[PDB]
RNA sequence: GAAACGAUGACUGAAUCCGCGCGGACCACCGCGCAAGGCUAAAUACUCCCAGUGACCGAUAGCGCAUAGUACCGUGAGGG
RNA sequence: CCCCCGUGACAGGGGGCGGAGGACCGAACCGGUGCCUGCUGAAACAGUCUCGGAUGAGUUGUGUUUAGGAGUGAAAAGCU
RNA sequence: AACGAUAAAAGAAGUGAGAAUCUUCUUCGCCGUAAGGACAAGGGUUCCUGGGGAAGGGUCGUCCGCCCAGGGAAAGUCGGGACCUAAGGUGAGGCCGAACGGCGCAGCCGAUGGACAGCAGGUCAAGAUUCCUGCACCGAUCAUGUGGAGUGAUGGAGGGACGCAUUACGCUAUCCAAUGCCAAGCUAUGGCUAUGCUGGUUGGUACGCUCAAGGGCGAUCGGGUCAGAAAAUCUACCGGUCACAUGCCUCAGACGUAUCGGGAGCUUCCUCGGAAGCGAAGUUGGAAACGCGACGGUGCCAAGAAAAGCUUCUAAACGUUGAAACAUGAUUGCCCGUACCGCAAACCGACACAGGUGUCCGAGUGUCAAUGCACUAAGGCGCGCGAGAGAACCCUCGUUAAGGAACUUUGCAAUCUCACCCCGUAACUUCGGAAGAAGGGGUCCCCACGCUUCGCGUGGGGCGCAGUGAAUAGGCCCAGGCGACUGUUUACCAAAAUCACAGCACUCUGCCAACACGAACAGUGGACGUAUAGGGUGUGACGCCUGCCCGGUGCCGGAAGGUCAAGUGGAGCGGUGCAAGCUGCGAAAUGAAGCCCCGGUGAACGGCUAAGGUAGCGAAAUUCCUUGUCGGGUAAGUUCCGACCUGCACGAAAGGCGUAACGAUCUGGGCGCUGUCUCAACGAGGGACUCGGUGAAAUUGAAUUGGCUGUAAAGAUGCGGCCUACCCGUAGCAGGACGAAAAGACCCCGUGGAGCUUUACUAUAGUCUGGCAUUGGGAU
RNA sequence: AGAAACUUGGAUUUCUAACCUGAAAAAUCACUUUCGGGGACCGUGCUUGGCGGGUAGUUUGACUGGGGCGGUCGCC
RNA sequence: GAUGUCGGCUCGUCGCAUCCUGGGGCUGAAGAAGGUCCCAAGGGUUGGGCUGUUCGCCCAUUAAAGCGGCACGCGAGCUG
């Protein structure tokens, strides 16, 4: 679903439940390092804060927990699930599709393959669908935290499990990494139609500016009298279509059949 | 017509100040160059 | 360039006195020298400054200034 | 959201209520549409009148960051 | 020429060497969401007193923001520092770097924000939450006494702590009414004799069983160790118990009493002007905040700082007979800023400049509301040249006969239109809109009746040419082109049909991500983001749709062969020496990306010998011929609408064709209305003219500077012939003086420049690739 | 013509003391670590060749009834 | 080291190869109305639609709706 609007120049929205507002770090907006602007645009915003959120979830092993509330926080594009443990310690985690309020979530290598539970891949059943996966034991989960995303399991190697990353890429991820059962719910962001100009602004600044508007000084596509261009390239004349920007590397042999 | 010059004490003291010429040697260069300039008056007495 | 020799940036990496470096590719004679450790006034350069002189100026000259880097301009550097 | 009526492939319709908006009109304020006057002018870019935005991609103070092949630019080679 | 806004001034009186301008009086006009008042920044004695008259002041000058001298500015509480932190800055250690240097954790600095103890009056010529009077309050050190025992850290916890819009209740500031209260007095003009007129009508502190809307709070026992590094009685938890509405806690503010102030005026003295003394009442009714009660209520998506002070708990330490806590006096309050200007004559603009400058307060009457509009209060001001004249011309306004767009590039300009109420309102449509469509009607005063509040409706009546009676105040419609839309842009000739835009597509990217800044295996941005993510690109809501061609170019994939660098390898050739041997060049094979070569990819460059136009469109923002041909409107239509097709040279995301709405866009038509016009006229004001005062400028070979014909370097005042013409001025006009202004921007020239482009040349960051180095071991 | 054996090299594979690198009370660090993963690659240093309007320096003739376009530059 | 350029508007003035008006000759001139040539430059030469246009086309007129020059007269006169 989504919210809708009668005709006042509008389309969509999302639907947000479970209100709390609890206990986390501030953050500041900025687009660049010591020098000039690096990553283009996104200088706007509603002045969000940041909710430190556990990914790895190691030390809570052997200790059960209850879902408190599910709050919807920026810098995420996911449902944040609040957790209270038996320790007395509160912690934030991501909130997979179909996790009710106040279910039971347990961590560790012994844990049962149920929603929200943390447990390494070696224990993960064949063909199961999980999110929040580490590339390496420790650190955190770099995989499947996004809008409506998941990763399934394609087999075992030695320490390694064959996983399916949600570009549809096959890869070898060792079984020594924790993982979280289920797909990150996130409603579906692809649904929300982002309103009108400045709905962008709500979350971040003025979007794509076509170099073909620019001038020879400014960008390659610049110059000319009319609307056109010849040779098809970016800020620097690399070019966008089908040029592998990857390099020859280590994890490249930890990767199998990347195609798309 | 808002003019080029909008006087601010703490600004003219932050940029241009003696303490400001301290931090770098381009400005200490300016100092000694000014001392020998004749007896000029270096920035923050002015 | 036939480019010797000094000099290092990267790989290499010998001899030691019937020995080693040179002598403008290189060879043999023939000479000249003995590297990989250091210091070493003097004769040389300059003029903030003091003295002395001048087929140098003498108030639009002479230094910008017969004192001022002041007045005055500039956000500033700077100019004056 | 609360009441009245309508599902023969059809929808929602009337009332009460609520207070939504890159909604309207409009002074601040922000902006410069058209004519005139002005031409070292009152002014090195304005004045009267007319006009545009007027809860939003809004306006504005303070402190600060980014600069010369460089910055910045809802993009004129504009601004620095 | 000008004397810097067209907010006018006038008379008397004073002073003085001298007055339109300085002082006083009395009037006048002007601002009054300001043109009043208070602060910030910035300025720096501009403030006050007494002088002064050179220059400065656009005239004057006895005068001033100018000149001289003297004075004036007071803080435990206000703002800042001795407190805290944000961006940012910094930074021992630490990570980099030819240097100088770039980074960086803690810590530290850094208000714009957090925290934090007083209010009310008085008054010098000039200061006031500062000084003085009344009564407060905060922390500190210590003394008598109570208590008569724990205090309870750079560490934990709690709490500081935060959005936007909208809104119920109670109150205050504060304003309004009155045959309330108080005070003063006279008032005549025709009347009023007060029932008229004018002014004044509570601030602080204290107690008080008074009144009060609103506002936020559950309490204790105990459990697990895995949680707050440890600790804990504090906090987080799972649990037990009592608490559902009564309940507790505080009371903005009102009321009473008290008391300290203030208060219309009042009395006396006056060195010609202020001092000093006194002191009335304080009602009822209404309105009312963006402030207060409060951190209220509900809803919404974009989801709305940190850190100390502070509250509780232990660690350690000292003490558990002399603790913490309380009030009860005393003593104590360090540093810096306070004057004045501060929407402007004092700040930024060379100027006493029509400009610019952030926050606060900003009264009353009429008006649906209001910071609008008109007039006014308090307050401030008439703009530092005057006075006359009433010509052309010029600017800014007012009215206009008959006509009404005939004006013109174009209705450019200027009318008409105008508020609020009622009625009424089309094609088309995204069912919201179009819409304030279009039209029509009401509007003032009195009286009676009614009503849900200021008031409103009904009926009747009265007045004027007219009743949003003056000010604020949309002309409208029919067709199109472009873009959908709000928005954005060329500071100073372009606001648009540009850019952006939601939406759509291609592609990149597995996370020390691609990508970008960078002396750099530093660091950082992407991002404390992770493949319904992040980058680049091009299209541009929405609706129907997006065709044919990859030959060449780029791009991804491939593998038979062709070519190719260093290097590993070394056939052979030569110099030399008697030799040993030292030495010059040197091949075959072997050696990587790479390009040639095969294939595929177009919402990749691109095309209509690779094919050569699918729909849709077409004389279009592309149309040459061209005023194409028919028609529509017009009396007449090179434009506009419609239709055709011969499309010089439309066409599918450099999108094709459509679309309601939107538009200071562009184009054509109509209605309305007008000085746009036939064709101008009268009227006003401000310049222009004249007198007194101050008094520039661009320009300038020198001039004693005519006309016609001719001649000359080819456009004569200056040469010739002929004509005309007394000297000198003032108001005027713009033909001439190739008039003025900027060493033409067009154009050519220069083996002059700079921006830009590329399949021009060349190098290079970057990047890829073979080898060697860090760099090692074993199975094979 | 079998092969014990020291083996110098190239190819895939594997290992761990180099190196990179994440977690843990000690945020950038360094430390002891249980370690965890990658790992002779990657990075980086020298050289080799490619690519390289991203950048940089420059070139782009004259005659000419103005320049350009066309034409023409020597010789008989 | 500058002679502002199309068209209009305003103001004119000049030539005559005369559009009208005046005087004549000839006529394939009965009259009426003409066609042409000669003399003649006093004066006169309309208002609108389209177009930036001069030109040109058309509406309704008229005695007639003349042609050129004056830097394709005229921007220190206006427009633009
Ligand atoms: Mg452009
Ligand atoms: Mg370029
Ligand atoms: Mg281009
Ligand atoms: Mg351009
Ligand atoms: Mg004046
Ligand atoms: Mg006046
Ligand atoms: Mg008034
Ligand atoms: Mg004077
Ligand atoms: Mg009264
Ligand atoms: Mg003045
Ligand atoms: Mg008012
Ligand atoms: Mg008339
Ligand atoms: Mg009339
Ligand atoms: Mg007309
Ligand atoms: Mg006309
Ligand atoms: Mg108009
Ligand atoms: Mg638009
Ligand atoms: Mg403009
Ligand atoms: Mg296509
Ligand atoms: Mg026609
Ligand atoms: Mg707009
Ligand atoms: Mg004469
Ligand atoms: Mg003469
Ligand atoms: Mg003559
Ligand atoms: Mg004149
Ligand atoms: Mg001239
Ligand atoms: Mg020239
Ligand atoms: Mg030439
Ligand atoms: Mg002309």
Coordinates of C-alpha atoms (C1' of nucleotides) in Angstrom, one line a residue, chain E residues 188-382:
Chain E
rA188 C1' -21.4 84.4 25.5
rU189 C1' -21.3 83.3 19.4
rG190 C1' -28.4 80.9 18.2
rG191 C1' -28.7 77.4 22.1
rC192 C1' -26.4 74.3 26.3
rU193 C1' -26.0 76.2 32.3
rA194 C1' -25.2 70.2 33.2
rU195 C1' -27.4 65.1 32.1
rG196 C1' -22.4 70.0 29.0
rC197 C1' -17.1 70.5 28.3
rU198 C1' -11.5 68.8 29.7
rG199 C1' -8.2 65.8 32.3
rG200 C1' -7.0 61.9 35.5
rU201 C1' -9.0 56.4 36.8
rU202 C1' -2.8 51.7 40.0
rG203 C1' 2.8 49.9 39.8
rG204 C1' 6.1 46.7 43.4
rU205 C1' 6.6 44.0 47.7
rA206 C1' 4.0 41.1 51.8
rC207 C1' 0.9 37.9 54.4
rG208 C1' -4.0 35.8 53.6
rC209 C1' -8.5 29.4 55.5
rU210 C1' -10.3 33.7 49.4
rC211 C1' -11.1 32.6 43.7
rA212 C1' -9.1 30.0 39.7
rA213 C1' -8.9 27.8 34.0
rG214 C1' -4.7 25.5 32.8
rG215 C1' -0.6 22.4 33.7
rG216 C1' 2.7 16.7 35.1
rC217 C1' 3.0 12.5 38.5
rG218 C1' 2.2 6.0 39.4
rA219 C1' 4.4 3.8 44.5
rU220 C1' 7.3 -0.1 46.9
rC221 C1' 9.2 -5.7 47.4
rG222 C1' 12.3 -8.4 44.6
rG223 C1' 15.1 -11.5 40.1
rG224 C1' 18.8 -12.6 36.7
rU225 C1' 23.9 -12.0 35.6
rC226 C1' 24.8 -12.2 30.4
rA227 C1' 23.5 -5.1 30.7
rG228 C1' 25.4 0.2 32.0
rA229 C1' 34.5 -1.5 31.7
rA230 C1' 34.3 -2.5 37.7
rA231 C1' 30.8 -0.8 41.7
rA232 C1' 25.9 0.5 43.6
rU233 C1' 20.7 1.3 47.3
rC234 C1' 21.1 4.7 40.8
rU235 C1' 19.4 3.1 35.6
rA236 C1' 17.7 -0.7 31.9
rC237 C1' 14.9 -5.1 32.1
rC238 C1' 11.2 -10.2 33.2
rG239 C1' 8.0 -10.7 37.5
rG240 C1' 4.7 -9.7 42.5
rU241 C1' 1.9 -6.0 45.0
rC242 C1' -1.3 -1.6 45.5
rA243 C1' -2.9 2.2 42.1
rC244 C1' -9.7 2.1 37.5
rA245 C1' -12.9 8.3 37.6
rU246 C1' -12.2 10.4 43.5
rG247 C1' -6.3 11.0 43.9
rC248 C1' -2.1 13.7 44.7
rC249 C1' 1.8 18.5 42.9
rU250 C1' 2.0 23.6 41.3
rC251 C1' -0.6 27.6 40.8
rA252 C1' -0.5 32.0 35.3
rG253 C1' -3.7 35.3 37.0
rA254 C1' -7.9 37.5 39.8
rC255 C1' -9.7 39.2 45.0
rG256 C1' -9.0 41.2 50.0
rU257 C1' -5.8 43.6 53.7
rA258 C1' -1.4 46.0 54.3
rU259 C1' 2.5 48.9 52.6
rC260 C1' 6.1 51.4 49.6
rG261 C1' 5.6 54.1 45.1
rG262 C1' 3.4 56.7 41.4
rG263 C1' -0.7 59.9 40.0
rA264 C1' -4.8 64.9 37.2
rG265 C1' -3.2 68.8 39.3
rC266 C1' -2.2 71.9 43.3
rU267 C1' 0.7 75.9 46.4
rU268 C1' 4.8 78.9 47.1
rC269 C1' 9.7 81.2 45.2
rC270 C1' 11.8 82.6 40.7
rU271 C1' 18.3 85.3 39.6
rC272 C1' 12.7 86.0 33.8
rG273 C1' 13.3 80.8 34.6
rG274 C1' 13.2 76.4 36.6
rA275 C1' 13.5 74.9 41.4
rA276 C1' 10.9 73.2 45.8
rG277 C1' 6.3 71.8 48.8
rC278 C1' 1.8 69.3 48.4
rG279 C1' -1.5 65.7 46.6
rA280 C1' -7.8 63.6 44.5
rA281 C1' -10.1 59.2 42.8
rG282 C1' -8.7 54.6 41.5
rU283 C1' -15.7 52.0 39.3
rU284 C1' -19.0 49.0 36.4
rG285 C1' -19.3 46.8 31.2
rG286 C1' -16.8 45.1 26.8
rA287 C1' -12.6 43.7 23.6
rA288 C1' -7.9 41.2 23.5
rA289 C1' -2.6 38.9 21.8
rC290 C1' 2.3 35.7 18.2
rG291 C1' 2.9 37.0 25.6
rC292 C1' 1.8 33.9 30.0
rG293 C1' -0.5 29.5 32.1
rA294 C1' 2.2 25.0 29.7
rC295 C1' 7.3 20.9 28.0
rG296 C1' -1.3 21.7 26.5
rG297 C1' -4.5 18.8 22.2
rU298 C1' -4.9 16.4 17.4
rG299 C1' -3.1 15.5 13.0
rC300 C1' 1.2 15.1 9.3
rC301 C1' 6.1 13.4 6.7
rA302 C1' 10.5 15.2 4.9
rA303 C1' 11.2 12.2 11.3
rG304 C1' 13.1 17.5 13.6
rA305 C1' 22.0 19.7 17.9
rA306 C1' 25.8 18.9 21.5
rA307 C1' 27.8 19.6 26.0
rA308 C1' 28.0 21.4 31.1
rG309 C1' 25.1 23.2 35.4
rC310 C1' 21.6 19.8 37.6
rU311 C1' 19.1 14.9 40.1
rU312 C1' 20.3 10.2 41.9
rC313 C1' 24.6 5.8 42.7
rU314 C1' 29.1 3.9 43.9
rA315 C1' 35.1 3.7 43.3
rA316 C1' 39.0 6.0 46.2
rA317 C1' 40.2 8.8 50.4
rC318 C1' 39.7 10.9 55.2
rG319 C1' 36.0 10.5 59.3
rU320 C1' 32.5 7.0 61.7
rU321 C1' 32.4 12.0 70.0
rG322 C1' 33.7 17.4 66.3
rA323 C1' 29.1 14.8 58.7
rA324 C1' 25.5 16.3 55.0
rA325 C1' 21.4 19.6 55.6
rC326 C1' 18.8 24.1 57.8
rA327 C1' 18.3 29.8 59.5
rU328 C1' 21.0 33.5 62.2
rG329 C1' 24.1 37.4 61.9
rA330 C1' 28.5 39.0 60.0
rU331 C1' 32.2 39.6 56.0
rU332 C1' 32.4 39.3 50.7
rG333 C1' 31.4 40.5 45.7
rC334 C1' 37.3 40.6 40.6
rC335 C1' 37.5 41.8 34.5
rC336 C1' 35.4 44.1 30.1
rG337 C1' 31.1 46.8 27.8
rU338 C1' 27.3 51.1 29.3
rA339 C1' 28.0 58.5 26.7
rC340 C1' 26.0 59.7 21.6
rC341 C1' 24.3 58.2 16.4
rG342 C1' 22.0 53.8 15.2
rC343 C1' 16.2 53.0 8.4
rA344 C1' 20.5 57.6 9.2
rA345 C1' 23.6 64.0 8.4
rA346 C1' 26.8 60.4 12.9
rC347 C1' 26.9 52.9 9.9
rC348 C1' 28.3 51.1 4.0
rG349 C1' 28.0 54.5 -0.3
rA350 C1' 34.1 60.9 -2.0
rC351 C1' 29.0 64.2 -0.7
rA352 C1' 24.9 66.9 5.4
rC353 C1' 23.9 61.4 -1.3
rA354 C1' 15.9 60.0 -3.4
rG355 C1' 20.2 54.1 -2.5
rG356 C1' 21.5 49.9 1.5
rU357 C1' 21.3 47.8 6.7
rG358 C1' 19.3 42.7 10.7
rU359 C1' 15.6 42.3 15.5
rC360 C1' 11.9 44.6 18.9
rC361 C1' 7.5 48.0 20.3
rG362 C1' 4.3 50.5 17.0
rA363 C1' -1.8 54.1 19.7
rG364 C1' -7.2 55.7 18.1
rU365 C1' -11.6 56.5 14.4
rG366 C1' -14.1 54.8 10.3
rU367 C1' -13.5 49.9 7.3
rC368 C1' -16.2 41.9 7.1
rA369 C1' -10.8 41.2 9.1
rA370 C1' -5.9 43.7 9.0
rU371 C1' 0.7 45.9 10.2
rG372 C1' -4.5 47.7 4.1
rC373 C1' -6.7 52.7 3.1
rA374 C1' -8.0 57.7 4.6
rC375 C1' -7.6 61.1 8.9
rU376 C1' -5.5 61.8 13.5
rA377 C1' -2.7 60.8 19.3
rA378 C1' 2.1 60.5 21.8
rG379 C1' 6.3 61.6 19.3
rG380 C1' 8.8 63.9 15.0
rC381 C1' 9.2 67.0 10.9
rG382 C1' 8.3 71.1 6.4

